[PDB]
């Protein structure tokens, strides 16, 4: 019935007009007067030389000393970043890994990829060896992202256009979120872990409620696939990185876009996005083999992190904000400061 | 300066490094092949002669092959096709009888053109297989090879038609100096397919070792 489609289109026009009426002044006008950040220079303090293939994911531990990296050579390695030592080396059953996570308590890690299975590993056991705790199956497409809520809950993002919330003890999908139209590529939990956002290949991002399992809001504006997403430290905003060489900042309360972070000479897509501790710096990894640092309040590039010989595939910032770790398609991780 | 526990941790790290190096050396001597196809074009039978991703392992003449079939990975192809960059060779299956059935050598031709000229597979050789010799040979005497290729002018014979299709498929590559294409008609079912794959892989390995040395 085309009447339903016409009603949907009318509702879309109504909501677009409603969010246009709320745009009084841009963020640029508000922050036209604050002093610029200046120039940010970071030197690679450490280099990790364990992997033998391309690195696809990494995640910082909550204690800001241990991090886990996943590469397509079939190994999970947990590094002690202060002294470069390797704490654990976990061999994976399937070597096509695309995602990785570290539990907030530090007891578990998660892994997944093209085999449509999320695997949970137990790090602290009496036998002294890392063992596979659970294997979560149920997605039809490849795992894109996974993030721990606690030691018993986890949210996973899959390429079959759906996101799900699991119960690790029982291994069953507690809730399924099904709103997207294309592959879901990214994921980000709120600081208070009551909401989360996902970026999909339909060039849209959605806001979900874990308790009720329904899409609160939908944000549009990108012109291509979305590869990365990350909440603002306040929790009232988030930033997305897409394939059209553009990063954008959205605000939940204003329900619309705020900034566009682009330059004329950048024509490559963004693979990873992250924020600093104070939320003033926005770090984004590109296909030009170097990360860029953006002034989030002024959309002016403040620095470049050029130390990699291949595409930067992952990026993360410690909880206390001391260091930035970037992994690339060459087998080296660089820790900046 | 290091304490006793720090020294023991460093020793553990070194032993982990040794194990990682050993597994890397062991894995570097295995040949990885990616299997592609338009549909039910003969992948099943070639797998027989030897969830998401499917792996197949077999050993021939003291050489270990791993064949990855990603037919069941139903999603956007460009979001994970770069995961297979660096494979030794690509195996392509084309149904030689699928011309009368409904212009189905045009989907195969488009897929071959897309995969051969892809950015990630500029230097990766492609092995081309043409399944279903007998069925196409039987069909060619009833259905002329003019439904798909009208410009073709020649006798309706198995050999000439097969050569015409082979020539049509081969020249679709733009970079003819950075990769080779090996063509075979896999219907003998007399272990000639495995031998041909082994020969092509050995030639590819030799032409790759003639580049690290600088000779090329």
């Amino acid at each position: 019935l085309d009447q339903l489609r016409q009603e949907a289109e009318q509702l879309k026009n109504q909501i677009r007009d409603a969010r246009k009426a709320c745009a009084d002044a841009t963020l640029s006008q508000i922050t036209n007067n604050i002093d610029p950040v200046g120039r940010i220079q970071m030197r690679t303090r450490r280099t990790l030389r364990g992997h033998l293939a391309k690195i696809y994911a990494m995640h910082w531990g909550t204690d800001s000393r241990l991090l886990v990296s996943a590469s397509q050579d079939g190994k999970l390695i947990i590094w002690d970043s202060y002294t470069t030592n390797k704490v654990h080396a976990i061999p994976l059953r399937s070597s096509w890994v695309m995602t990785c996570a570290y539990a907030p308590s530090g007891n578990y890690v998660a892994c997944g990829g093209l085999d449509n299975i999320c695997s949970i590993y137990n790090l602290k056991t009496r036998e002294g060896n890392v063992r596979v705790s659970r294997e979560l199956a149920g997605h039809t497409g490849y795992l894109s992202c996974c993030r721990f809520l606690d030691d018993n809950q986890i949210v996973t993002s899959s390429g079959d256009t759906t996101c799900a919330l699991w119960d690790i003890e029982t291994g069953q999908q507690t809730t399924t979120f099904t709103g997207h139209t294309g592959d879901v590529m990214s994921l980000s939990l709120a600081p208070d872990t009551r909401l989360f956002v996902s970026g999909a290949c339909d060039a849209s991002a959605k806001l979900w409620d874990v308790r009720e399992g329904m899409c609160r809001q939908t944000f549009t504006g990108h012109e291509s696939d979305i590869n990365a997403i990350c909440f603002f430290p306040n929790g009232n905003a988030f930033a997305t990185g897409s394939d059209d060489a553009t990063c954008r900042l959205f605000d939940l309360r204003a329900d619309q876009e705020l900034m566009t972070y682009s330059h004329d000479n950048i024509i490559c897509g963004i693979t990873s996005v992250s924020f600093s501790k104070s939320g003033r710096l926005l770090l984004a990894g590109y296909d030009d083999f170097n990360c860029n640092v953006w002034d989030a309040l002024k959309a002016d590039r403040a620095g470049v992190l050029a130390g990699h010989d291949n595409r930067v595939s992952c990026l993360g910032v410690t909880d206390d904000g001391m260091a930035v770790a970037t992994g690339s398609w060459d087998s080296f991780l660089k820790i900046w400061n | 300066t290091l304490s006793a526990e720090d020294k023991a941790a460093v020793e553990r790290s070194k032993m982990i490094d040794r194990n990682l190096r050993e597994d890397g050396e062991k894995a570097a001597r295995e040949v990885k092949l990616l299997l592609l196809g338009a549909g039910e074009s003969g992948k099943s039978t070639i797998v027989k002669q030897m969830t998401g991703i499917v792996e197949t392992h077999f050993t021939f003449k003291d050489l270990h092959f791993k064949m990855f079939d990603v037919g069941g990975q139903r999603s956007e192809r460009k979001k994970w096709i770069h995961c297979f960059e660096g494979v030794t060779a690509i195996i392509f299956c084309v149904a030689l009888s699928d011309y009368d059935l409904v212009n189905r050598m045009h989907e195969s031709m488009k897929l071959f053109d897309s995969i051969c000229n892809n950015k990630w597979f500029t230097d990766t050789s492609i092995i081309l297989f043409l399944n279903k010799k007998d069925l196409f040979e039987e069909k060619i005497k009833k259905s002329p090879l003019t439904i798909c290729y009208p410009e073709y002018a020649g006798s309706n014979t198995y050999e000439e038609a097969a050569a015409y299709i082979q020539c049509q498929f081969e020249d679709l590559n733009k970079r003819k100096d950075t990769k080779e294409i090996y063509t075979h008609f896999t219907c003998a079912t007399d272990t000639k397919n495995v031998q041909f794959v082994f020969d092509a892989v050995t030639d590819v390995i030799i032409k790759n070792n003639l580049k690290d040395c600088g000779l090329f």
Partner: single-chain antibody
Amino acid sequence: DVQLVESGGGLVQPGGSRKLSCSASGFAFSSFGMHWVRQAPEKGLEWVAYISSGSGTIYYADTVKGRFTISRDDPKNTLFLQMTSLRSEDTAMYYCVRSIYYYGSSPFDFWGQGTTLTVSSSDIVMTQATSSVPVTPGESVSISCRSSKSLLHSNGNTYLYWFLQRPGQSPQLLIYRMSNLASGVPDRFSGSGSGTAFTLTISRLEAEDVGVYYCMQHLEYPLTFGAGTKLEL
């Protein structure tokens, strides 16, 4: 089921030879460095030998250097100690101890049951002044240990370990690195202190807590134990 069983002890004439075995089961033996700890019939604990994972590093106490030899057989999951030229001062019970070293690990966590052996007839000093103290159930007690050299290291770790030995039993780890509780230890036990001054606090003491408490240092070899503080009543 992480038990370690020792065997090979008995009566031997002085100047003889004897070997001891430690059959491990229930854990990844090849990943753990193993120790040998000795206890005289009515004295405190004393460290003897240590072999690392992969047999890369071996250490001996100055009292047994040149006479004892330690080795391991990873495929057979057994630990050996070859003893030669035995004296009357070697009569004691020998314990088998496991310990794994990485960031955040808990060394000396499991002790074997021990085997008895009788023979016919610069180092950091840890002091435990209070030999014994009467304790009534339901109350709180404090045990003090002291070090002649500062155990605090430049990286922030204070290498002090607390052990409890119940009557007729092998010692059990309580607190490692002066502040962290071992697995399975109730929250009543608490450890605190500064360089060269440490204290163990027990709150709401009850039964099964009577025994002798030892303090050990892991800053540098050879590892040295305290005299031992004993609780009763």
